[PDB]
Structures are given as C-alpha cells and as structure tokens.
Design a protein around this ligand. Structure first.
Ligand SMILES: Cn1nc(-c2ccc(F)cc2)cc1C(=O)O
Ligand SMILES: [Zn+2]
Length: 354
C-alpha cells in the first residue's frame, strides 16, 4: 500500500539529495548571462526570480534539467485582456518618461514580446560563444516561453524564461481565484495577493503575455498547513508534499512510457500540481493529510485528477474561468487515453513505480 509509495518517495529523495556538480555548472553559466544582459539598455534591471535558487526542478525525476527565470521589473505597466482569455494579455504603458528602457520593443502602444525575445536571444547567443570555460550550445525551438534552452556538456539542459514583473494589483481575472480562505486563512490570501505577479511571453500569433504565479505556489508549499506548526515536528509531518511528488512522478513515468504515441504530449506537471491545490482546498485540515494515510491521501488526488479528465474540467488555481482541460486546449481522445492509463495504474498497484 504505502510501502511502494514510501520506497518511491525515498528513491526520489536519494536521487535529488545525491552529490552533483550540475548546479555548479548552471550557476556559473547564468551569472555570466546576467552580467552581460545588465550592461544593456533594455535589460539593466534583469535578475534571477528567486535569488539563491538555480536548481529549480519542474521534473521530479530529471536531475539534469533545470528551469530558470529571469525577471525584468516593468513599472507603470497597462494590461489589456486579449480575446476574453482570462490569462493572456497585451502589455502597454501609462508612460511619462516615454523614452523608457523598453521603448525599443514598442509596436505602437503595444509591447512586442517577439522583439524583446529577439534582443534577449541575441545577447545570450553573443555570451554563449565568449565562454571559454564549459561547452554551452543554444538550442532554439518554437516557443516564446521557455525563450531559450541551453545545453551544458551532456544531459545538463537549462530552460530560460524571461518574465516581466508587475508590482500592481492582480488582474480582475484572479479576483475569485486562490480560494485558500478556509485552509491558509483570509489574511494569508490578502498578503499573497499584495505580492507581485509575472507575465511570460506566450500564445493561446499575437504579441501576448500569460499570467504566472509559480512564486505564490512555491510560498504556499513551504507553509501549507492549517496549523502554523505543520511539518515542524519532522517525526509527524503531513503527506501533502509527498502526494504532490507522487502525482508528478505518475504523470512523468506515463509520459515516458507513451512518448512514441502523441496522446500525452499536452499534459504537464502543471495540470497535476493545479489538481493537487484543488484537493488542498477540498481537504483543508492537517488531519486529512496524515503521514500514516499516505496511500489514502494519494488516492484522493488520483480520483480528483481522474474526475477532472473525465468531466474535462480543471480550473486554473488563480484564474477560475481558465479551463486547463478545455477541448480546444486538449482534445477528448488524449484525455480518454490518460484516464485509461491512470485507471490501469491504480488497478495494478501503480506498475510505473516498479
Ligand atoms: C499547461 N500549462 N498551462 C499553464 C498556464 C499558466 C498560466 C495560466 F494563466 C494558464 C495556464 C502552464 C502550463 C504548463 O506549465 O504546462
Ligand atoms: Zn505539512
């Protein structure tokens, strides 16, 4: 029951905690990019999102794949929702010193993502060659975010996303989102909602940006209990983080198994992570997440995610009217394929964790 799950969580811990020079190679490459980008008119205010975090792993089993975010403070930003999408926006400016650092990317009153990504990719291309230390090659694929993919030596890949940062109130599409009031409290919601938000270049091909709150997600996960003391007693933690890891590895393993088929290509840890936050709101009490009940708690997540694929509904945790499971985003057959693969996993004591 929880035996296989515990063994899985223990191997994942050991693979994550093991000694590697990977993060060292990555830190040096990034610090180098940042110092080059800073002596440029457009990117003088560029910085790492979380200062101290380079080893940010989206994949729970990939210790050689890194995900880094470079944020750029955009003061006096004006947002205009694109085509009732709730999550995609045009970036405009209120403007007084109109010859602003980003004026070079303006296509009318509109901030071009394409023009900003071009300049950014170019400066990064210029710094990659100038490196005499390690073997770094700039892999380019169709995608606004991650803007860049670097490959340091073998297996060490780094995804770089450029993100605009806004320190203004969150867009109206978020007003009913982050329903943590009965779990984390109403005062925690007000405090997180006073924090900045990020816009990443992304299409739903227009010059649009997608809202990003992964820094709020990171804060929640490190202070996730109804009680302020949750997991401070290491002998009696809750199994919240474990259930999330297991949901991520389940999907990772199913994607690896069916990589030749194209059916699971559109699913990502983001879908499984969002579903897990919806189960947190559903089950707000720390007693609903006992370390002893790992198996049952994991089943609660599996069943809820399964309900989501079947009903074709998975709301974005921050933007309630953004449906991650819409038929225009992911077609029914792909969803039915995932439901079938997950149902087989549950009914065969998750063979993907063998
Ligand atoms: C599949 N997906 N959707 C998002 C998303 C992010 C912000 C939004 F407002 C809406 C959607 C991120 C991912 C991912 O990481 O795959
Ligand atoms: Zn806890």
């Amino acid at each position: 029951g929880a035996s296989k799950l515990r063994a899985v969580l223990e191997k994942l811990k050991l693979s994550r905690d093991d000694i590697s020079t990977a993060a060292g190679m990555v830190k040096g490459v990034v610090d180098h990019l940042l110092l080059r980008l800073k002596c440029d008119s457009a990117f003088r205010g560029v910085g790492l999102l979380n200062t101290g975090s380079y080893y940010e792993h989206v994949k729970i089993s990939a210790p050689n794949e890194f995900d880094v975010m470079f944020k750029l403070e955009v003061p006096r930003i004006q947002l205009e929702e694109y085509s009732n999408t709730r999550a995609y926006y045009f970036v405009k400016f209120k403007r007084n010193p109109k010859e602003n650092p980003l004026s070079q990317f303006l296509e009318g009153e509109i901030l071009s993502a394409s023009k900003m990504l071009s300049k950014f990719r170019k400066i990064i291309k210029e710094e990659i060659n100038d490196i005499k230390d390690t073997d770094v090659i700039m892999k380019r694929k169709r995608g606004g975010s991650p803007a860049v993919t670097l490959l340091i030596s073998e297996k060490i890949s780094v995804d770089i996303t450029l993100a605009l940062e806004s320190k203004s109130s969150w867009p109206a599409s978020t007003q009913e989102g982050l329903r943590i009031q009965n779990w984390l409290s109403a005062k925690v919601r007000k405090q997180l909602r006073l924090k900045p938000f990020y816009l990443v270049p992304k299409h739903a091909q227009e010059e649009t940006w997608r809202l990003s709150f992964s820094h709020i997600e990171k804060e929640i996960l490190n202070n996730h209990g109804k009680s302020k003391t949750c997991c401070e007693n290491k002998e009696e933690k809750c199994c919240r983080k474990d259930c999330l890891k297991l949901m991520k590895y389940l999907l990772e393993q199913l994607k690896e198994r069916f990589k030749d088929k194209k059916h699971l290509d559109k699913f990502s840890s983001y879908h499984v992570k969002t579903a897990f936050f919806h189960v947190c709101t559903q089950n707000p009490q720390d007693s609903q997440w006992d370390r002893k009940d790992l198996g049952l708690c994991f089943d609660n997540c599996v069943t809820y995610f399964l309900q989501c694929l079947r009903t074709e509904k998975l709301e974005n945790y921050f933007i309630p009217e953004f449906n991650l499971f819409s038929s225009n985003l992911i077609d029914k057959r792909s969803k039915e394929f995932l439901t079938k693969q997950i149902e087989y996993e549950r009914n065969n004591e998750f063979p993907v964790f063998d």
